[PDB]
Amino acid sequence: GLDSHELARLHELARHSHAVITRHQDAGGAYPAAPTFSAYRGYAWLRDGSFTAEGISRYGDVASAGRFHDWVDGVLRRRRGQVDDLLAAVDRGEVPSNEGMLPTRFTFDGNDGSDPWWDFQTDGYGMWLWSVVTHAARHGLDLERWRAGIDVAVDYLLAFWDRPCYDWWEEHVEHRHVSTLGAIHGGLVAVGTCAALRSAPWSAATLQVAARIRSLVSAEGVVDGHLVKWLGSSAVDGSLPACVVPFGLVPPDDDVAAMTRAAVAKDLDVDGGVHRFAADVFYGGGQWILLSALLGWNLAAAGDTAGALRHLRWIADQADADGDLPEQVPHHLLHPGSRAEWVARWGTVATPLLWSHGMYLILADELGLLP
Secondary structure, three states: OOOHHHHHHHHHHHHHHHHHHHHHOOOOOOOOOOOOOOOOOOEEOHHHHHHHHHHHHHHOOHHHHHHHHHHHHHHHHOOHHHHHHHHHHHHOOOOOOHHHOOOOOEEOOOOEOOOHHHHOOOHHHHHHHHHHHHHHHHHOOOHHHOHHHHHHHHHHHHHHOOOOOOOOOOOOOOOOEHHHHHHHHHHHHHHHOOHHHOOOOOHHHHHHHHHHHHHHHHHHOEEOOEEOOEOOOOOOOOOHHHHOOOOOOOOOOOHHHHHHHHHHHHHHEEOOEEOOOOOOOHHHOOEEHHHHHHHHHHHHHOOOHHHHHHHHHHHHOOOOOOOOOOOEEOOOOOOHHHHHHHHHHHOOOOOOOHHHHHHHHHHHHHOOOOO
16 A cells, blocks of 8 residues: 555655664663753653654664663662652551652653652553563563562552543643553553563552553543543543553454544544644644554554554654654644744744654554564
8 A cells, every 4th residue: 555655755764763763862771752842851751762662672673672671670670769668658548749759750860850749640650561561572581671670660550550640741630541541551461461470479469450440441431432531521632542552451443442543533633643632732732743653553453554554644744854753743733822832932843752753663563664
């Protein structure tokens, strides 16, 4: 379904995606979110980094992906005491405030880059577990290299998975977001079904808590046959397909998977460019490359190769003259009046966004299109 013209350009964008990710990887192994965007530069996120690492692992750069996992593992081992103290506090009946939780932004030397009162999120820890297990399985690696960091993440998530937190988009701290629950589920199932981790003391617990997550989503996170943005809401969010692939709340051919893909397409997908959520005013609510990639990935997994390809083509059309992929583009805006202020305050949209490139690599790989 691709001619030589398209294949050449898609191959080149894949090569360039690998290059921009590995060029900007920090000396210590972290992947930055966006080296030139004012509000993100200097920081690493586990969410962005884990998807980026998965794209790089699929691409076959074992060294680069391994250095990212080394970095995360070391950062988490340094939080062993913090996590133990949070768990002890829970055991005393003194539940820690959001202000005491593990961070969202990391500096490249592994310190808190932001105050979790303002951005507390648990999804990234779940994504990292999914990412590191998937990487090790793909390349035949011994997970003991990263196990002590895995242990910190697992202990943290088993304790705090059911806590309200901000969503992937740093909004609505009072709610429990289905793509956050989904990320945690994906990480817990990854470690709980990993033969190398069969003797871990938390082995059984991870699958039991994953089942608890699915119970909660079944009870409060499905409406009219589709997943919803947060428990007790009716709306969808463009992140929701991640709950199918890769995080596995339901199989790709499940009715809830089909209905969720359809609802996201209807409510949020304009010409192949997927919006985050209807109320999104960030840069006027533009079309997000990573979300078009996520939807494409899910379409491919469900057997809709044509739909996957249409989304891959849309993404490729957003590459700039150097091949860099932005965070988002404004071809369609949900709330156009809101864009100007964002541009004035933070500058033009983050480009390149490493996560855009990571997701491009994943979707290209799903379609068998890596060079």
